[PDB]
Amino acid sequence: YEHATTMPSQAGISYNTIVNRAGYAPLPISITPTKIKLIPTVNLEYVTCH
Amino acid sequence: ELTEQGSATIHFSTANIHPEFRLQICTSYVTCKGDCHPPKDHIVTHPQY
Amino acid sequence: CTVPLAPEPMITFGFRSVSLKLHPKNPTYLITRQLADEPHYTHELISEPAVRN
Structure with missing residues (x-):
């Protein structure tokens, strides 16, 4: 059963929802994001010092 | 099987999106x-019932 | 006599449709027919991986 939703990009806060199939019992879905990284593609050119 | 004041649960099968039928139970129609x-x-x- | 046994087909369901992914080890007949007054049967020899809708 294809179910699409949307979650805000904010850590710590639990995000709750359910899935209502039209003649069955509602299925609850919970997603709590903990740590959301962002890792760029990093390319060393040179180092320097004294 | 009927008790005196209980509630009897039946199972049925249908094709109707808004089913409505008179259920005969032994004298009467509900x-x-x-x-x-x-x-x-x-x-x-399994085939169709 | 001991006869071989083909891999399990991977059946995908749709509205009034059945798809079949078929990976045979050695060539294998797929024989289908409808359960109506016109059976429309299909006797095919599948030797390669093939999808049949």
Whole structure:
């Protein structure tokens, strides 16, 4: 059963929802994001010092 | 099987999206009215009832 | 006599449709027919991986 939703990009806060199939019992879905990284593609050119 | 003041649960099968039928029970007719919903499977492995 | 046994087909369901992924080890007949007054049967020899809708 294809179910699409949307979650805000904010850590710590639990995000709750359910899935209502039209003649069955509602299925609850919970997603709590903990740590959301962002890792760029990093390319060393040179180092320097004294 | 009937008790004195209990409630009897039956199972039925339908094609109706708004089924409504008179249920005969041994002398009398009671009206059963509701709204059916589409099932979850497309192709099943038993014939139609 | 001991006869071989083909791999399990991978059946995908749709509205009034059945798809079949078929990976045979050695060539294998797929024989289908409808359960109506016109059966429309299909006798095919599948030797390669093939999808049949």
